[PDB]
Design an enzyme around this catalytic site. Structure first.
Site, mmCIF file in Angstrom:
data_model
loop_
_atom_site.group_PDB
_atom_site.id
_atom_site.type_symbol
_atom_site.label_atom_id
_atom_site.label_comp_id
_atom_site.label_asym_id
_atom_site.label_seq_id
_atom_site.Cartn_x
_atom_site.Cartn_y
_atom_site.Cartn_z
ATOM 1 C CB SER A 1 32.140 38.526 41.890
ATOM 2 O OG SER A 1 30.608 39.008 42.375
ATOM 3 C CD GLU B 1 27.238 36.036 30.621
ATOM 4 O OE1 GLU B 1 28.000 36.576 31.409
ATOM 5 O OE2 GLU B 1 26.712 36.700 29.648
ATOM 6 C CD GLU C 1 52.131 29.740 59.630
ATOM 7 O OE1 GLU C 1 52.515 28.572 59.029
ATOM 8 O OE2 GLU C 1 51.780 30.052 60.397
ATOM 9 C CG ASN D 1 35.793 45.777 42.219
ATOM 10 O OD1 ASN D 1 34.584 45.200 41.583
ATOM 11 N ND2 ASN D 1 36.554 45.134 42.728
ATOM 12 C CG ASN E 1 40.178 41.888 36.989
ATOM 13 O OD1 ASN E 1 39.737 40.800 37.555
ATOM 14 N ND2 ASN E 1 39.998 42.483 35.962
ATOM 15 C CB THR F 1 27.201 46.607 39.153
ATOM 16 O OG1 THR F 1 28.154 45.639 39.407
ATOM 17 C CG2 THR F 1 28.535 47.969 39.345
ATOM 18 C CB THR G 1 28.407 31.802 38.189
ATOM 19 O OG1 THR G 1 27.385 31.513 36.937
ATOM 20 C CG2 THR G 1 30.158 30.582 37.579
HETATM 21 N N1 LIG Z 1 37.803 42.366 38.687
HETATM 22 C C1 LIG Z 1 37.145 42.380 38.293
HETATM 23 N N2 LIG Z 1 35.505 42.090 38.788
HETATM 24 C C2 LIG Z 1 34.673 41.892 38.496
HETATM 25 C C3 LIG Z 1 34.500 41.102 37.092
HETATM 26 N N3 LIG Z 1 33.194 41.271 36.543
HETATM 27 C C4 LIG Z 1 32.516 41.495 37.714
HETATM 28 N N4 LIG Z 1 32.950 42.264 38.607
HETATM 29 C C5 LIG Z 1 32.710 42.307 40.044
HETATM 30 O O1 LIG Z 1 31.631 40.894 40.377
HETATM 31 C C6 LIG Z 1 30.345 41.745 40.419
HETATM 32 C C7 LIG Z 1 29.333 40.744 39.814
HETATM 33 O O2 LIG Z 1 29.848 39.879 39.051
HETATM 34 P P1 LIG Z 1 30.035 38.577 38.399
HETATM 35 O O3 LIG Z 1 29.808 38.156 40.099
HETATM 36 O O4 LIG Z 1 31.440 38.141 38.220
HETATM 37 O O5 LIG Z 1 28.492 38.235 37.489
HETATM 38 P P2 LIG Z 1 28.380 36.706 36.930
HETATM 39 O O6 LIG Z 1 28.805 35.528 37.439
HETATM 40 O O7 LIG Z 1 29.326 37.033 35.685
HETATM 41 O O8 LIG Z 1 26.806 37.064 36.806
HETATM 42 P P3 LIG Z 1 25.718 37.856 35.858
HETATM 43 O O9 LIG Z 1 25.895 39.112 36.371
HETATM 44 O O10 LIG Z 1 25.004 37.140 35.700
HETATM 45 O O11 LIG Z 1 26.380 37.193 34.618
HETATM 46 C C8 LIG Z 1 30.560 43.108 40.174
HETATM 47 O O12 LIG Z 1 29.935 43.976 40.811
HETATM 48 C C9 LIG Z 1 32.268 43.339 40.276
HETATM 49 O O13 LIG Z 1 31.982 44.282 41.048
HETATM 50 C C10 LIG Z 1 36.230 41.653 36.382
HETATM 51 O O14 LIG Z 1 35.915 41.680 34.926
HETATM 52 N N5 LIG Z 1 36.774 42.234 37.439
#
Ligand SMILES: Nc1nc2c(ncn2[C@@H]2O[C@H](COP(=O)(O)OP(=O)(O)OP(=O)(O)O)[C@@H](O)[C@H]2O)c(=O)[nH]1
Ligand SMILES: Nc1nc2c(ncn2[C@@H]2O[C@H](COP(=O)(O)OP(=O)(O)OP(=O)(O)O)[C@@H](O)[C@H]2O)c(=O)[nH]1
Ligand SMILES: Nc1nc2c(ncn2[C@@H]2O[C@H](COP(=O)(O)OP(=O)(O)O)[C@@H](O)[C@H]2O)c(=O)[nH]1
Ligand SMILES: Nc1nc2c(ncn2[C@@H]2O[C@H](COP(=O)(O)OP(=O)(O)O)[C@@H](O)[C@H]2O)c(=O)[nH]1
Lengths: 434, 54, 428, 433, 428
Positions: D133, D64, D247, D199, D221, D172, D138
């Site tokens: 994640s 994206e 290690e 989280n 973050n 979410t 992705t």
């Molecule tokens: N620390 C941190 N965690 C995140 C963030 N965005 C998403 N997460 C965690 O990652 C989970 C899914 O987000 P992503 O895997 O990044 O979503 P994506 O890979 O962009 O895929 P799409 O939702 O289709 O856009 C959420 O449930 C959050 O808990 C972020 O910006 N910072």
């Protein structure tokens, strides 16, 4: 090195700790901001020391309801206490042992004992715990009792000393002290290592008679209780001829395992414009403790016999004027001791004079706190017995406790344990015939 | 840590003041708008002052 | 860069689209004449989602204005944002649909659809990576039902991997501006099922209920109703258009809200809506947005969500907010109302957050909900259809224009069979 | 010579990167632009284009455009070599599938190409740290394809993974369960060690310890960054007992398919709460084991610790470490499995945690523990329940089989993870023979 | 932090609540516009027991004003502290109760119960630790009896562990205001028994006895009567909202004044009450407060407690005061009058000491008492019901709105079955 942790349960115990830590900070020199003023181990037993001379009390101020902790964390001594040490719920126990012990005690006991073990981790030699509460309110009964249960199962090799505000035999402040006191005593009888009682009608009497304060407040009452706890926990904070310890208190005041109930009195309660005219000799201070009127639990000692007395002198006391004065106490006929304690005294002497907080009490150089385990307390226990029987004859205020999660049958063995305690208190009473 | 604590307190105070200003701006922009004002001049047609957008 | 091509059909669709283009041009900073004059540099990063470039720094909306009668012609041109659309994409017909699905689907509609589709090509292969089409129309009546469903079928068979969001205004039982409209809705649902990927059903009863009970207007008009529609129309596609954390676009919403290809019907909602005299009483926060999001007075469909279990819920937020509190509000909604959510989809709420709020606001959000409770809409239109079809009422028009009794029977059968899985998955 | 190529994949990965790279730049000096304002410690993370520009050694990938297009217009626009930031013109739509079979195998080519360039300019690749994640296209799909393709080229080289495991209650997304289970299956023989951070727990840590009642990704973050800078603190600064990136594998992953260490930073306190604590080696160590300062919502007492890796930093006297570790062993609550007596890979760096204009306070000591408890079984089982809760009615599966994933891979996935749940049982029972 | 949701039922309930919010905004420093113009931090420290936050520092009461006729609510809004309540909590009816308990409990009251119950879930859900609810209503007449008891029933059914306080205006023995009051009172006492945690019975005859003999005014108004009502009403909830020593909140009051679940009908009393001419000559002190509070002259329910034995007594003092006189005066009033308290409850009085007094005064106290002598009221309404129901009075209107002939019988039977234990416990 030689430290003990202070827990303050309920509104009563929290203001206990307010007066006690104000006195401690004044006598050790600690500013209200925590920092020492510019100009080594004496504080180390009751105060920690982080970083650039920041001294944090080794205490937890637990209550189930706010605004009494909020006065602490808003007023003068806000910076001295760690804000996490002050522990606050969100709903009041509302004068229920059942609410203190069964439903809203579980929301805070894990946090309370997590911070207790956090304090205990930074403790090389932990002497024990000082547990300040009352036999009244729901927090100070139920949460204190569950605290004793889990503290016994977690730190059972340590000493647990109790400062309990005993309910007055006449006036009280509510209608459920007869339930609360018996219910907490049944489950804290086998867990509390020692339990010093202090009444409040008797401090009303003391403040009226010896202190010339016709309008006393709780400031005066448990500021005097602060003076008592600073009198008993001072030989480990300073140096003395008889360095008495908290471990020795139970051994010299608890004859039988169930009988762990001493009463406290303090001498020179004299009032500034009464103190320049009197010598306040050691004979005076040791006679004022054994008068049947300066005892601060409203129960005359002559209706009973002393098992043991721990006298703690403080200041410019002569280590042989003290026993020349104890001789007269032994020879007086009105003070009667048991036949199975030929030795009934423990002497604790330290060279630290009493520290005068801004207020009423005078600059004195001789003081003594006297702790007696006496058979007279069976009378006040029988008063609570009669009151509980009167309430429980046709189930007054019982729905409040039985609809709480507490079973109805708990009152039954809470009364049978009390009856056994009375039988023990009378069986220890009569003289030897065998 | 103290400098950090005072800076964080100042940041929170400034953020609360900024949030209150943004709240009042939001209130003013919706009070002065078109949906929550019932302006009779919404129907100002581009074809002249005699016609209205229907 | 991802593009959305905006189709408008019917008088209802044309006016909703006109208000939508007005409000989206207010959000991006384009004036009536087409040029950009705003304040933020974040309004030009993703302007190629709705606006094509032109010479002289002029932004032109990618809208296909369609109607079978040249009076909506005059209406959308006489609107305040009239001199902003392409006159070449601005197709019209020398006819009248006449509240007739037959005259929208098997007649002059099927003759105008060639030019409509040609304009769709002109605006669709003039892109590099197009996400989908967004058709706004009304199910009750002609044009928006007939031309709408016919154009839906043609564009779905032309581009099969692109997302077609239909914003459909569905008839109501309280007030009816057409006697025939159960027939039109019954015929239109059949093409709405096996085609569009995201259908937003919007009811005029619920639009007036939000306009009167909540916003407390005195004389609510079609412009205000269409603004209530276009707030969610703009708020659905906003992480595609402004930055944020957990950016969610149309495909991510469709994936997280459509468990089965026939269950794509939703119930929108938009919830910074407060009355003039009660707006100074506000305590506007994320719990207040979730509160006014999740009640049965902000829904824009005439279907009470207490009569059916939520299959999926998506909330697309806007503004500077805390992810902990947004997640907590969705979690406590799920936990407190447990009977109103199905149990075979655990954590059936999707959260999206955009950082930039809409202009003139600080903190907004939109509701989308795939719910069981849209049983009521399709059923009530079904009994109205069976009442009007048992005695063959208003049917000589359809039969003379080229329909069949088996065609009406099949439309009703398919719509009742859309009424069946929304029963069986609400009953597990 | 101690290089660490870092691939960030997904809003999660890319956004955690912003935090990680800020901390790295404010520690080594490299200014936001790319020049150290008028000595070779940066060669573990940055480079030097014979001119004074220090380019990060990383490839930020996100199908994206939104996210990465704010790092190519922010106050770090220059640092990152234009190419490193790699994007696509269409999201993956929370659909593991459209991230491992369709709109994802179309960018593996370019990414592996860049990983190659940043790896041919390394005189000692210690490993590839991948931040993703477990829930998301992705974050699951590309990471899966990447981990696999990496294995084909870079053979057995370390491929440590940092991840945001599906939360136990928040979550979410309605499809999270599916993606998480499919990910582990594809990355259960291609991942060396996979640090986990949820989280929900960081939210709690950011309320009972940091007093930020309203945590925002930026806060969470940044906390995760301090962990990455501790796992990679001995490779750029000096110490008494250094710890490499090769290690953690041989000191945290016990049996084959069991590589899910949990993370916990010890001194996560706030300015107005550090003016009261001595934060000493003992205090902070007991804090890491406390079932609250953890970071993957999962009571450690609901299971048995398999191996621990306490990575310290600051004024940590080597002897106070021996003291604390000993006292932890004495306590019962912390129950270590019998088949692992020596259960503590201790490591001590010296650089006192760097303070980034943010929330955490100026602490002199710190400890980042990595535990492989068998209490992660409950996590895998809760996630498992949700997979089944929906896979019964074949829910949200049309989306996955309409891109390239045979519907049977969901069954092969559930089966693989059932073996993992049973595995987490056999490696917990104590031999009584 | 703890919260209280305030409910007003009927014309009398709305007037009592209007004066209550007048004196509570007076007590906290809230102007009629709503923002804080005060002089101390403690007034703002615990303003979150009655007042929600809003934008601009505009604290809004959590009051739900309920009436089936929209005539007195307009007067409430047009009063001095009128532009302070939410327009959305302002729930009314397009009908008339007509002082008919069946029309308040089994008709349009049960149609408007939904709107009120939605509002009070909003006001209970905008919380995290609610303490309970506080209904003000008139026991005689409609709405406040019928609708009020229905509201109490639904709230007590949905929130099982929250304290319900009900300030109920019982009709006078000597004068009578709406001729069917024994019907309304006997039908509503049956729900007041089975529902409420605390009931505060108040009487207009006792209010006039205070206003004419203790206050020695000439032309008193209902403003002054509700001023007395709200004086004790704010006196009850003062340790909840301000600091002090021996803090006692509503659950503490409930625990230490109901020995048995039936006898939750209390008699309040406020007693720094002194006229304009005698306020100069008063010698304000704690013994004077105790004697003026325990005198059977400042009693606010028209039942003399000399005819019965006190079961439990609670005194909540207010102001800087020494504890020894408070304890000594309570012990002394227990000792001097020995036959006026029961023997099976030793030390049957609770003391609370709140720190901040009402301003304009130096030292105040409020009374609560669970006297056995409240049975005079219940026997009086019982004989009024029996001697009037014997000839089937006013009854076609009660049976035509949805009752039956049986419905009155168990109401009177339960009222006599409460008359019985408040004979047994009064006679040991
Ligand atoms: N620390 C941190 N965690 C995140 C963030 N965005 C998403 N997460 C965690 O990652 C989970 C899914 O987000 P992503 O895997 O990044 O979503 P994506 O890979 O962009 O895929 P799409 O939702 O289709 O856009 C959420 O449930 C959050 O808990 C972020 O910006 N910072
Ligand atoms: N010095 C001093 N003594 C007090 C204070 N408060 C209470 N006491 C004594 O403690 C007794 C009982 O009060 P508590 O046990 O604290 O009541 P509680 O623990 O707050 O329980 P709740 O009423 O449920 O909140 C009273 O009878 C007093 O005699 C105080 O604030 N200061
Ligand atoms: N939201 C919204 N709905 C509208 C508007 N104008 C008309 N409608 C609805 O559209 C329905 C009928 O439209 P219709 O006659 O079929 O338009 P046509 O498609 O051009 O024939 C009416 O019942 C209206 O309720 C509008 O401007 N906004
Ligand atoms: N304290 C007080 N009592 C009032 C007030 N107004 C009315 N009352 C009493 O309320 C009773 C009648 O209330 P009612 O007509 O039933 O109100 P309704 O519930 O709206 O029908 C009368 O007996 C009055 O004595 C007031 O302003 N203050």
């Amino acid at each position: 090195q030689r430290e003990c942790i202070s827990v303050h349960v309920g509104q009563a115990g929290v203001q206990i700790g307010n007066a006690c830590w104000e006195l401690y900070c004044l006598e050790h020199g600690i500013q209200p901001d925590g920092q020492m003023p510019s100009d080594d181990d004496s504080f180390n037993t009751f105060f920690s020391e982080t970083g650039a001379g920041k001294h944090v009390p080794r205490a937890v101020f637990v209550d189930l309801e706010p605004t009494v902790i909020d006065e602490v964390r808003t007023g003068t001594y806000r910076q001295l206490f760690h804000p996490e040490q002050l522990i606050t719920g969100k709903e009041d126990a509302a004068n229920n042992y059942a609410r203190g012990h069964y439903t809203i005690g579980k929301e805070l006991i894990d946090l309370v004992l997590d911070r207790i073990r956090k304090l205990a981790d930074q403790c090389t030699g932990l002497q024990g715990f000082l547990i300040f509460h009352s036999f009244g309110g729901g927090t100070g009964s139920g949460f204190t009792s569950l605290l004793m249960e889990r503290l016994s199962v977690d730190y059972g090799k340590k000493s647990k000393l109790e400062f309990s505000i005993y309910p007055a035999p006449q006036v009280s402040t509510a209608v459920v002290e007869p339930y609360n006191s018996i219910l907490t005593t049944h489950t804290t009888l086998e867990h509390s290592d020692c339990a010093f009682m202090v009444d409040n009608e008797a401090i009303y009497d003391i403040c009226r008679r010896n202190l010339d304060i016709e309008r006393p407040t709780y400031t005066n009452l448990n500021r005097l209780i602060s003076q008592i706890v600073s009198s008993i926990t001072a030989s480990l904070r300073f140096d003395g001829a008889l360095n008495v310890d908290l471990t020795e208190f139970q051994t010299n005041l608890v004859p039988y395992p169930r009988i762990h109930f001493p009463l406290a009195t303090y001498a020179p309660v004299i009032s500034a414009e009464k103190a320049y005219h009197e010598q306040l000799s050691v004979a005076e201070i040791t006679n004022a403790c054994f008068e049947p009127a300066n005892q601060m639990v409203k129960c005359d000692p002559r209706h009973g016999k002393y098992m043991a007395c721990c006298l703690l002198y403080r200041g410019d006391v002569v280590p042989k004027d003290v026993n020349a004065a104890i001789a007269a106490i032994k020879t007086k006929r009105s003070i009667q001791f048991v036949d199975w304690c030929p030795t009934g005294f423990k002497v604790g002497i330290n060279y630290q004079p009493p520290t005068v907080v801004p207020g009423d009490l005078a600059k004195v150089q001789r003081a003594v706190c006297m702790l007696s385990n006496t058979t007279a307390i069976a009378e006040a226990w029988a008063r609570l017995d009669h009151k509980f029987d009167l309430m429980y004859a046709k189930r007054a205020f019982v729905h409040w406790y039985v609809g709480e999660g507490m079973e109805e049958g708990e009152f039954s063995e809470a009364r049978e344990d009390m009856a056994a305690l009375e039988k023990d208190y009378e069986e220890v009473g009569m003289d030897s015939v065998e | 840590n103290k400098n950090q604590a005072l800076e964080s307190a100042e940041k929170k105070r400034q953020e609360r003041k900024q949030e209150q200003e943004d709240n009042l701006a939001e209130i003013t922009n919706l009070l002065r708008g078109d949906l929550l004002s019932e302006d009779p001049q919404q129907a100002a047609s581009s074809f002249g002052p005699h016609r209205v957008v229907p | 860069m991802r593009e959305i091509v905006h189709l408008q059909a019917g008088q209802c669709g044309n006016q909703i689209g006109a208000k939508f283009w007005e409000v989206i041009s207010d959000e991006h900073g384009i004036d009536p004449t087409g040029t950009y004059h705003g304040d933020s540099d974040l309004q030009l990063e993703r302007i190629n989602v709705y606006y094509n470039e032109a010479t002289g720094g002029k932004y032109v909306p990618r809208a296909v204005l369609v109607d079978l009668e040249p009076g909506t012609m005059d209406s959308v041109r006489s609107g305040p944002f009239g001199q902003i659309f392409r006159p070449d994409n601005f197709v019209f017909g020398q006819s009248g649909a006449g509240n007739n699905w037959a005259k929208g689907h098997y007649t002059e509609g099927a003759e105008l659809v060639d030019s409509v589709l040609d304009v769709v090509r002109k605006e669709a292969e003039s892109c590099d990576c197009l996400q989908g089409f967004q058709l706004t129309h009304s199910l009750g009546g002609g044009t928006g039902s007939g031309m709408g469903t016919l154009l839906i079928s043609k564009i779905r068979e032309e581009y099969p991997d692109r997302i077609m969001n239909t914003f459909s205004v569905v008839p109501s039982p309280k007030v009816s501006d057409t006697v025939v409209e159960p027939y039109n809705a019954t015929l239109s649902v059949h093409q709405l099922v096996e085609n569009t990927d995201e259908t937003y059903c919007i009811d005029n009863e619920a639009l007036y209920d939000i306009c009167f009970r909540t916003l407390k207007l005195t004389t609510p008009t079609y412009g205000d109703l269409n603004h209530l529609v276009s707030a969610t129309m703009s708020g659905v596609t906003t992480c595609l258009r402004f930055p944020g954390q957990l950016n969610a676009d149309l495909r991510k919403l469709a994936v997280n809200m459509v468990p089965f290809p026939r269950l794509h019907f939703f119930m929108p909602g938009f919830a910074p809506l407060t009355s003039r005299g009660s707006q100074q009483y506000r305590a506007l926060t994320v719990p207040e947005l979730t509160q006014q999001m999740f009640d049965a007075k902000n829904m824009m469909a005439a279907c009470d969500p207490r009569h059916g279990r939520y299959l999926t819920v998506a909330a697309v937020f806007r503004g500077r907010m805390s992810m902990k509190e947004v997640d907590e509000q969705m979690l406590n909604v799920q936990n407190k109302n447990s009977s109103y959510f199905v149990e075979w989809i655990p954590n059936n709420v999707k959260t999206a957050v955009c950082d930039i709020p809409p202009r003139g606001l600080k903190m907004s959000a939109t509701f989308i909900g795939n719910s069981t409770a849209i049983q009521e809409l399709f059923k009530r239109i079904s009994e109205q259809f069976t009442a009007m079809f048992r005695r063959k009422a208003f049917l000589h028009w359809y039969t003379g224009e080229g329909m069949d009794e088996m065609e009406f029977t099949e439309a009703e059968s398919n719509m009742n069979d859309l009424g069946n899985p929304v029963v069986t998955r609400g009953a597990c």
